[PDB]
Amino acid sequence: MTKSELIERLATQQSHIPAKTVEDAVKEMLEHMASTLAQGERIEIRGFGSFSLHYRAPRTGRNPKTGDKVELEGKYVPHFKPGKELRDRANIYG
DNA sequence: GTCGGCATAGTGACTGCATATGTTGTGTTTTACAGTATTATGTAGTCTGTTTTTTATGCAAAATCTAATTTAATATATTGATATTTATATCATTTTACG
C-alpha cells in the first residue's frame, strides 16, 4: 500500500466524495503531519499511534565502508509509537 | 464514267418604280407636381390609482461551538540481555512527474 494506492482504496469506498477531493485530502494531511513534526510539535492519534522527536547528541561518526572519521551535527529524529488498538490488530500471535 | 463544250444554277451587281421611313407643323387629351387646408394620427408631458419590486425586521427552527469535566491514554523511572538502526557515497532499482 503506497501513497497512491491509499488514496485509491479510500476513493473507491467513498462514492459521495470526489476522487479529486480525496487525492488532495490525503496529500494535505500528510503534509500537515510532516510540517508539525518540523516545527517541533508532537502528534497523538488515539488508536493509531503517536509521533515524537528524539534528540541525537553530536558524535564523531565513522564511514561504514572505509572506517574514517566524520563529524555529526546534533539533530532530532522522528519516532512513531504504535497505539493500543494498532498493536492488538497487527499482532497475529498471542 | 471522265473529259470537253454551251447549257445550268444560285448568288451578286445594277437601275428605277413603289412605299415604309424620316421631318416638319397644327391641335386634342391626360399625366404630374406645387401650395394651402382638414383631421385623424403616434408620441409627448403629466397626473393617478393599481400592480410590481425593493426593503427592513421578525422569529421558530437547527445544531454547531466553547467550556466544565472525567478517564483512557501518555510520560517518567527502574534494569539489563538482545535486536535494530547507524555515519558516508558510489551503483542499482522503484516511484514520482510532466508531455
Side-chain angles (χ1 to χ4, degrees), chain A residues 3-94:
Chain A
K3 181 180 181 181
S4 59
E5 300 181 300
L6 179 62
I7 304 175
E8 297 180 60
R9 302 200 302 180
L10 293 177
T12 303
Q13 298 182 58
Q14 300 300 299
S15 179
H16 54 66
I17 300 176
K20 178 70 168 56
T21 300
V22 181
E23 181 180 60
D24 300 302
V26 181
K27 289 181 174 59
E28 293 298 299
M29 296 184 268
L30 292 174
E31 182 60 60
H32 192 184
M33 298 181 89
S35 61
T36 301
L37 296 176
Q39 299 181 59
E41 184 179 0
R42 55 174 293 190
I43 302 178
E44 183 180 301
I45 304 300
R46 298 299 180 64
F48 184 62
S50 58
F51 297 66
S52 57
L53 305 179
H54 293 179
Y55 178 61
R56 289 289 184 291
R59 61 185 187 68
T60 304
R62 294 237 312 172
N63 196 298
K65 187 95 172 186
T66 55
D68 294 297
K69 302 172 167 174
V70 58
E71 51 72 52
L72 301 183
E73 301 290 2
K75 60 182 177 182
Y76 300 114
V77 297
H79 186 297
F80 184 61
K81 197 283 175 182
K84 182 177 173 297
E85 181 180 300
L86 181 61
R87 297 197 301 290
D88 296 304
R89 298 181 61 180
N91 181 59
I92 58 176
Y93 209 9

